[PDB]
């Protein structure tokens, strides 16, 4: 079995540069508060 | 560690949970277009990856149970747990149907004319073929008994004639309800009482089909020497859900047919 | 009739590093590729669908 | 709990940083979506 | 007459079953009556209250499908 | 006598089945399916843990009412004693594995 | 590799984990649904559009909340990763049927979306009631698609709730008896069995009013000579447990929480405590009724509902009194988790009582379908399932990790989020005894001042959930790894380190049989 | 109707309305003993320096904090219970006017002896002349004579509704199909306000019902010109 | 009616194969005489266009949308009237 | 009305009393209370001299003849009227 273990090894994204977790970070939950949003605009722009 | 010293099971990895959970996607709104835009390929699609799925699903529990050698004890009496919970999640679907057909039938709106059956609808005759259906399910259930008999005895050939005799009588019932079906003078369309009568009978018709197909796989892995006359969990599973499906029906046909007709 | 489980047994215990779903053989991996791909495609349609079936 | 120090720190510039990062990537889209919001019933 | 009375028969918060029974009383009386005379009976009653507690919808439909023959009530 | 060709399983249990099988009828449960029965638990009768390897935990339920379980590496060496009640532990090797 | 791990598991951490993501990531959807509906209720007037547009909004709050974040990551989360570790289990009885547990969700999550894409949406409430959720009141493709994703989900927590029951009870060690297992996997064991009896007569519901728009059933439908009521009973049946289903793992956590922070061994009155999950479990089945007084049932049958559902106090009671035995003679530690705790203590208390008012059936006529019951609900839900999620998290955080979370961050986001909640709901008790009814876009002026500070109110929360992801991202930018964990002799999860090994108990615990 | 920054009920317009506000006292007064109880027993069991970490006795208090709350139950469930079947008590209406829920609107049918019918609509915003009430003010009231025994026979011809009117404290869902009874009796007359209390559509919050008591004279002339 | 067949309906095979064949069995015979000994066939009845029956609020989806999934021309009317 | 209560309610004392006097018996402690707080007293029913009731083909061997084994003076009415 080569699966990794320890700190940082049982998630299914990469922490190892800060920045760059920020960045995924960001878009994952960004992207769920986001939704919404434009779902309601989805809807007001039709007829 | 790494030498395991319990004797449970860690199943490898299996790509049959994402296929099947993808497949449900598939059927539901495949259903989804059927229903609205008029279109049947999706839930074609759908209806052929979970076959897939499932057949691939089960043939691994069968390598890893009859050739493998990961059934222990302590695996099997884990698999009974599983099963039982299973038919009692069963027991209760069947339950918001009855109890539908109950709260109908116990107060029929003026709009069916303030009676059961409501006036219009023709209810078929109990002592005709709903009692040879009765009567089919029953023996089916006694056939079956005397198969699982012979197998914790070792008799192959009377194991599988027995669960042959319950194979075809359980046959013999969908082919007689099928022609019910087209015989009979109400429909999905007819207020409550056919609404109430289609959906318990046919999701009940589904269940003996399922039944059905479960003990063919039994009949073929029997040729195939896979059950020994001490392990057969299949087996049992397999006469666990045949005879809830007799009595599902011993309630329907109680219940719907004779009561509430 | 047959029995021949046994020679599905040490079939089976064939310490080949595959995982059960492929141990079988190479029809395991056509079915496989086969079911893997009607799944993404169908969801793919599926998607195609849902979305075009979202405006007017 | 006790716990080894910081492999990696973050430094209270850092923090800031991620902070608004955080704050603006919920703050942004929403506030967009709501400030033409009379534009889309207006069509 | 005020309006229809207390019913013990009809005692609970849903009142469907009390137009209901009267709008069949009645008619039903209306037919007896004249399938003999009866010096020219009529049986009121049942029309005043099934009209006091009968929406007017269920009642105009009520007797649309006794015009077509198609009221599933037995009278 | 007398029967019709059904395999048994002593003749057709496979893997880890077959093992805990035969294991069983020697008596020995190399597969940990039975509850270890205590001994005396004082320093020169300690109860003996089995292991396969130079650690295991060890639970101890040291009044037998106790819905409370109390739990503790046992390392091979000199034997051990459960935190709230001493009770002897000593590491054994395991055995019929493999 | 990345496939075969994430997408192809049989490992209840692995699963565990991937819960909780789709857990957060929910969360955060339901989030913005919470935060529009606020910012159409704020000030008088209409912001979004009609009722249609804005109870989209309500109903697609209710279902994300419920079914999309506080029970996978309840369950599916906590429930697979610690279940397994605190009776030392090698993993769960169906580690593929439960890997197809979590991979349900996402599709069910997607019906769900599209369902608000297409045509108008479901404006129907989280109940979706027929004749309004029929073929006429919301003719089209979404109300069909919001219960097909009801079916997934449904069937993914029954498969769950069968490894669930499997497991807690055929995998503890051979000499351990279930009284001898924790709390929290007695939790998540009576959960699991709540699930398995409620959640298929939903199915049953649902599946009937969807022939009733698709194959011209019509078991709801008067005109067939259906019940538009029928339904109510059908779902409600699975509706009050659904409650309890989201409470009892939040008891069990809580249970966990304080008693570890109070440095006790064990919790105030273990079999008090089992006994009284097992009587709330028992109870929930035979009340759901009191969800229909305003209906048109006989008084006779309004009085049993009403008495029954009193009696839950009870076992609730001895719940409530125990915890607070078990901060006793404690050894108090004001870390962030047990803040979390005595906040669920106190607030969930207020709340439950709340819904001891709105028990009476004679003055249930004149709150039901207010806002009050909205008070209500937020207030155990809230402010007692979600404050029991956050105490969990940051208290096992470690455990699933192998990093520390900032505590002093950790006490700001709670000191923050307390307030937000308490303002936004607290008023709503007002504006319900005060008339203002339930899935209203608008309010006469009166009820200005209260939706003004509500909303306001709401706006807080906010700002704690976006101080509670940079709180996550800290803990995984720093990295300090744990080194030591307290009462460990007690507390299992904790005995293979930070995180636990991808396979834990390969070698079974040893215990006695004394 | 309610006032800006309203905390309780609406003031009593009907003896059960009355009833009710003191049920609700007597229940309040519950509530807020036992959480006033639990904020001082955590904050005490928090405030001290002293420990006892061993083993405690349990069930021997738990007798205590099991009989009592079922005390406190049979306290509440009396008056509530007394409260309940008086409301659906034996009483003997003089009139009866039915209403029905329609997608955004009610209409009303007086039909005991004329066949009055009406509808009811909400006056747009716009519509409103100076002094009425921003979303309640409905076309046409349902004119009653005050204190008097009315049954009102709720229903629809839809989608649930549920007619609802606190002030008198009174929800009846409207469903389509049935007959739901409600017994309404003022004892002052005046104009008394409600709303739609049942998810309905576009419109759910749209469409509310407002109830002008008069004496039985003027509500006499009212129905005659009424039609 | 009752039941008392003297003895033996429980444990050995030979015993479930006899109840198989000697209870079972033939009763499926029996039953299935009956049914055929009465098998002619009913009248289609009286067609009458009430309400509370051949619902539609919406189209099947299959066919030309007015007619079941088991619909059978002689038994069953459409709601306009019988098949012909 | 259904039941539910998660688990335990098979194989081992402790588990059996635990149901007895964790369920069993509180449930007759509440039927008890329930009882008699409904426990107020029947109007004496009115009497009407009914023939299909008060039946006497036959005395009694016992007492006067007339009086059944529990007879109840304020609620049992003789075949000519009540007790008194
Ligand atoms: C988190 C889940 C949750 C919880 C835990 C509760 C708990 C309870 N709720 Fe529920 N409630 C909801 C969430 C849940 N509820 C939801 C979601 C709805 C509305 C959904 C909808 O319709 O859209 C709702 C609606 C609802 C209704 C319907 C009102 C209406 O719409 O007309 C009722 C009425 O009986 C009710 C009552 C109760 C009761 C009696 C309890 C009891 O469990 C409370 C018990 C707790 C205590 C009492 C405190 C602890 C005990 C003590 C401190 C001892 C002293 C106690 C006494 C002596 C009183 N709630
Ligand atoms: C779990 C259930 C839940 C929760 C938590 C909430 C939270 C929120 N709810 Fe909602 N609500 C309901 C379920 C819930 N709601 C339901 C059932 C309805 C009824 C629908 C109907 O009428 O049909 C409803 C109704 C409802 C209404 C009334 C609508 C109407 O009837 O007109 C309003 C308005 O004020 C509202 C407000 C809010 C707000 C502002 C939040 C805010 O408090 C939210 C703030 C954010 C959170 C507290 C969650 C943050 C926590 C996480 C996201 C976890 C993060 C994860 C990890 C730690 C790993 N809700
Ligand atoms: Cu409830
Ligand atoms: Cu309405
Ligand atoms: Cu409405
Ligand atoms: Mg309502
Ligand atoms: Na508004
Ligand atoms: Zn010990």
Known sequence: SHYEEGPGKNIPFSVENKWRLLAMMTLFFGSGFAAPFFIVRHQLLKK | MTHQTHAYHMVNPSPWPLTGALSALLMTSGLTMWFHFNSMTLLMIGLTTNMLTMYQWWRDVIRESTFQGHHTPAVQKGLRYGMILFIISEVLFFTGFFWAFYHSSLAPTPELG?????????????????????????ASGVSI??????????????????????????????????????????????????????????????????????????????????????????????????????????????????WGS | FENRVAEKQKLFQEDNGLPVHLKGGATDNILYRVTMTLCLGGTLYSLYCLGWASFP | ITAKPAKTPTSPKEQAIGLSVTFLSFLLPAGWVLYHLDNYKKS | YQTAPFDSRFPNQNQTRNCWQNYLDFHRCEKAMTAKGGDVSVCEWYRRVYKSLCPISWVSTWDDRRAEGTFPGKI | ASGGGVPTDEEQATGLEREVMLAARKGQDPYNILAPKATSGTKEDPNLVPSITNKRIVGCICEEDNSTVIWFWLHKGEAQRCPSCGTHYKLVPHQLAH | ???????????????????????????????????????????????????????????????????????????????????????????????????????????????????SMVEAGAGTGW??????????????????????????????????????????????????????????????????????????????????????????????????????????????????????????????????????????????????????????????????????????????????????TMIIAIPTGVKVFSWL???????????????????????????????????????????????????????????????????????????????????????????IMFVGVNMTFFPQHFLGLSGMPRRYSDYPD?????????????????????????????????????????????????????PPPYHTFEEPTYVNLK | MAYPMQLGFQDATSPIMEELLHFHDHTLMIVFLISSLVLYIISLMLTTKL?????????????????????????????????????????????????????????????????????????????????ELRLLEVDNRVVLPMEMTIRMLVSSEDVLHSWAVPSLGLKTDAIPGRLNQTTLMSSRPGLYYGQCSEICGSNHSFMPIVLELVPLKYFEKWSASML | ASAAKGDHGGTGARTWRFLTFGLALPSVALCTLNSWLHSGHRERPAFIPYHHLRIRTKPFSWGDGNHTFFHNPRVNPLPTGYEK
Not at chain 2, 245 to 252: I, Q
Request: glycine content about 8%; proline content about 5%; overall charge negative.
């Open chain 2, 114 to 138: 303030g009676c059961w059956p409501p006036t219009g609808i023709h209810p078929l005759n109990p002592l005709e073929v709903p009692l040879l259906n009765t009567s089919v399910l029953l």
């Open chain 2, 145 to 258: 008994t005397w198969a699982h008999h012979s197998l914790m005895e070792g008799d192959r050939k009377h194991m599988l004639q027995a669960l042959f005799i319950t194979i075809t009588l359980g046959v013999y019932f969908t082919l007689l309800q099928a022609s019910e079906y087209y015989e009979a003078p109400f429909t999905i369309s007819d207020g409550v009482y056919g609404s109430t009568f289609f959906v318990a009978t046919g999701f009940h018709g589904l269940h003996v089909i399922i039944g059905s197909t479960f003990l063919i796989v039994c009949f073929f892995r029997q040729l195939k020497f896979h059950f020994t006359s001490n392990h057969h969990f299949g087996f049992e599973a397999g006469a666990w859900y045949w005879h809830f499906v007799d009595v599902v029906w011993l309630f329907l046909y109680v219940s719907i047919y004779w």
């Open chain 7, 1 to 115: 590799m990345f496939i075969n791990r994430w997408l192809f598991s049989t490992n209840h951490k692995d699963i565990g984990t991937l819960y909780l993501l789709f857990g957060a990531w929910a969360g955060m959807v339901g989030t913005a649904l919470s935060l529009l509906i606020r910012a159409e209720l704020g000030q008088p007037g209409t912001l979004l559009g009609d009722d249609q547009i804005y109870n989209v909004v309500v109903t697609a709050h209710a279902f994300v909340m419920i079914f999309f974040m506080v029970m996978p990551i309840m369950i599916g989360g906590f429930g697979n990763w610690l279940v397994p570790l605190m009776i030392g289990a090698p993993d769960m009885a169906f580690p593929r049927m439960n890997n197809m547990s979590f991979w349900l969700l996402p599709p069910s999550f997607l019906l769900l979306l599209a369902s």
């Open chain 7, 127 to 308: 109940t979706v009631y027929p004749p309004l959720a029929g073929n006429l009141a919301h003719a089209g493709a979404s109300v069909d698609l919001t219960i097909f994703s009801l079916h997934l989900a449904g069937v993914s927590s029954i498969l769950g709730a069968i490894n669930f029951i499997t497991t807690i009870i055929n995998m503890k060690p051979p000499a351990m008896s279930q009284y001898q297992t924790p709390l929290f996997v007695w939790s998540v064991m009576i959960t699991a069995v709540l699930l398995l009896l409620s959640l298929p007569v939903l199915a049953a519901g649902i599946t009937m009013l969807l022939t009733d728009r698709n194959l011209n059933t019509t078991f709801f439908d008067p005109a067939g000579g259906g019940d538009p009521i029928l339904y109510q009973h059908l779902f409600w049946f699975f509706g009050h447990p659904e409650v309890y289903i989201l409470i009892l793992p939040g008891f069990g956590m809580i249970s966990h929480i304080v008693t570890y922070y109070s440095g006790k061994k064990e919790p105030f009155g273990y079999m008090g405590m089992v006994w009284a999950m097992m009587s709330i479990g028992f109870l929930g089945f035979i009340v759901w009724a009191h969800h229909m007084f305003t209906v048109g049932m006989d008084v006779d049958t309004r009085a049993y509902f009403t008495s029954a």
């Open chain 7, 325 to 415: 035995a078990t901060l006793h003679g404690g050894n108090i530690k004001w870390s962030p988790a047990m803040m979390w705790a005595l906040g669920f203590i106190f607030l969930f208390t207020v709340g439950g009582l709340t819904g001891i008012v709105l028990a009476n059936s004679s003055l249930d006529i004149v709150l039901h379908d207010t806002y009050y019951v909205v008070a209500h609900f937020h207030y155990v839900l809230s402010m007692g399932a979600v404050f029991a999620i956050m105490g969990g998290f940051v208290h096992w955080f470690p455990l699933f990790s192998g990093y520390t979370l900032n505590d002093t961050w950790a006490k700001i986001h709670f000191a």
């Open chain 7, 446 to 498: 009166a009820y200005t001042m209260w939706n003004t500070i509500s909303s306001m109110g709401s706006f807080i929360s906010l700002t704690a959930v976006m101080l509670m992801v940079f709180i996550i991202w800290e803990a995984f930018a720093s990295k300090r790894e744990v080194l030591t964990v307290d009462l460990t002799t007690t507390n299992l999860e904790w005995l293979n380190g930070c």
């Open chain 8, 51 to 131: 420990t006892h970490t061993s083993t405690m006795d349990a069930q021997e208090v738990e007798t205590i904090w099991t009989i009592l709350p079922a005390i406190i139950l049979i306290l509440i469930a009396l008056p509530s219970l007394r409260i309940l079947y008086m409301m659906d008590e034996i009483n003997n209406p003089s009139l009866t006017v039915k209403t029905m829920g329609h997608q955004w609107y009610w209409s009303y049918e007086y039909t005991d002896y004329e066949d009055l019918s009406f509808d009811s609509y909400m006056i747009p915003t716009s519509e409103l002349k100076p002094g």
